[PDB]
Amino acid sequence: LPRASTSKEVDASLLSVVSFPAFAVEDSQLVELTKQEIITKLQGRYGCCRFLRDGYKTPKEDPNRLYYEPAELKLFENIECEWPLFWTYFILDGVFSGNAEQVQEYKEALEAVLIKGKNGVPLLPELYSVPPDRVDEEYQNPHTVDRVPMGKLPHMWGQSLYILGSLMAEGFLAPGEIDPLNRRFSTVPKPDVVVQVSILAETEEIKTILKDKGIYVETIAEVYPIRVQPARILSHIYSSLGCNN
Amino acid sequence: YVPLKDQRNVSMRFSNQGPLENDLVVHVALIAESQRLQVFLNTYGIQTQTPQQVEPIQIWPQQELVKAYLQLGINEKL
């Protein structure tokens, strides 16, 4: 859980796993730990980055070329552009369970980075790029130089998630309606379970031996309504589900 | 007045299954009262739901409908 993969120290995409879509996580202490870590390491000025040392949409790299040469010494350090998707994730994550002040903070943070287009409607830019000239200053003063919008911005994913979050926060719709399966209670502890074990003897000799020491069991006979067989037969039975000719 | 062949899907007089038939299926809903009772029933395999999990729906006693019906049919002039 703490690390996305063996080669990546942290990825921002772990937020989606541990937020509104597909709650699959336990031990909420780890949830708080990963949230604090992503906040303290990937937070920027007008957005957050996916992961350290990505060169996508950079004034270097010769973009018309793929298959990066192994020369990423400093050409992709502290110039990672931005990604407001993980910012608009936070507002939904906060408004989901019980958090309200963080929702207001993130809303006021994201309202500063919006761009108004035709007809005066909200629009979410994809990323903000560092100017090609002011590059040396950022190496000494990270997260200080202003950036410029660049790339496509008909971002339907981010706009849809943001408008869904706004509709959720407006109070028109309840959190229990989006998920009728009730996936919000994955953090509720389960106390314990009681295991039942049955003992049977193969032959009459074994039953006699067990009864000699005071243990009462029954053989495979006398329980004719029920039957026992190995699990390989069960797997061979399972090998016929969903078969179409 | 309807003929004997038409009495199939009339309202408040005959059922959809025909006059000389009675095979109605009725629906039941299981709702518990307290968390302790529902977990105790679940320990024996009994499935029941606490009243706090049906938030969009509401369960009210019979006097609410009585007072609502009493509210209706009021005129001031007469």
Are A182 and B53 within 8 A, CB to CB? yes
| B45 and chain A in contact, CB less than 8 A | no
Q: Report the DSSP pairing between strands A127-129 and A218-219.
A: unpaired
Name A213's Cβ contacts closer than 8 Å, sequence gap at least 6: none
Beta bridge partners of A148: A129
Confirm if A67 and A33 have CB atoms less than 8 A apart.
Answer: no
For residue A23, give how far its alpha carbon lies from the nearest alpha carbon of chain B (Å).
Answer: 19
Q: Does B3 touch chain A (CB under 8 A)?
A: no
Q: Which residues of A touch B55 (CB under 8 A)?
A: 174, 176
Task: State whether A177 and B56 contact (CB < 8 Å).
Answer: yes
Straight-line distance from the first to the last Cα atom of chain B, in angstroms, rounded to the nearest whole number? 38
Instruction: Catalogue the long-range contacts made by A158-165 (C-beta closer than 8 Å, 24 or more residues apart).
Output: A158/A84, A158/A85, A158/A88, A158/A124, A159/A122, A159/A123, A159/A124, A161/A85, A161/A88, A161/A89, A161/A92, A162/A88, A162/A91, A162/A110, A162/A122, A162/A124, A163/A122, A164/A92, A165/A88, A165/A91, A165/A92, A165/A95
- Rounded to the nearest angstrom, the minimum Cα separation between B25 and chain A is 26
Sign of the alpha-carbon dihedral angle for A230, A194, A29, A168: positive
What are the beta bridge partners of residue A149? A128
Report chain B residues whose CB lies below 8 A from the CB of A177: 56
Closest residue in B to A193 (Cα–Cα): B43
Q: How far apart are CA A3 and CA A9, in angstroms?
A: 5
A–B interface: beta-carbon pairs under 8 A: 6
- Pairing verdict, β A218-219 and A200-201: parallel
Taking a C-beta distance cutoff of 8 angstroms, is the pair A123, A116 a contact? Answer: yes
Measuring CA to CA, how many Å separate A160 from each of A16, A119, A165? 15, 18, 9
Please report residues of B whose CB lies closer than 8 A to that of A174: 55-56
Is residue A96 packed enough to be buried (19+ CB in 10 Å), middle (13-18) or exposed (0-12)?
middle
Residue ranges with strand state E in A61-187: 127-129, 148-150
- List CB contacts of A200: < 8 A, sequence separation 6 or more: A217, A218, A219, A220, A228
Q: Helix A85-96 vs helix A156-169: angle between axes, to the nearest 10 degrees?
A: 20
Q: Which DSSP category does B52 fall into?
A: G
Count Cβ atoms within 10 A of the Cβ of residue A245 and give its class: 0-12 exposed, 13-18 middle, 19 or more buried.
Answer: exposed
Q: DSSP 3-state assignment of A185? A: helix
* Cβ-based neighbours of B49, under 8 Å, separated by 6 or more: B30, B31, B32, B38
Nearest Cα to A114, choosing from A166, A76, A37? Answer: A166
What the block records as the tokens of A35 is: 């949230």
Resolution of the PDB structure in angstroms: 4.2
User: For residue A113, which of A95, A138, A88, A76 has the smallest C-alpha distance?
Assistant: A88
Dump strand ranges (E) for chain A.
127-129, 148-150, 200-201, 218-219
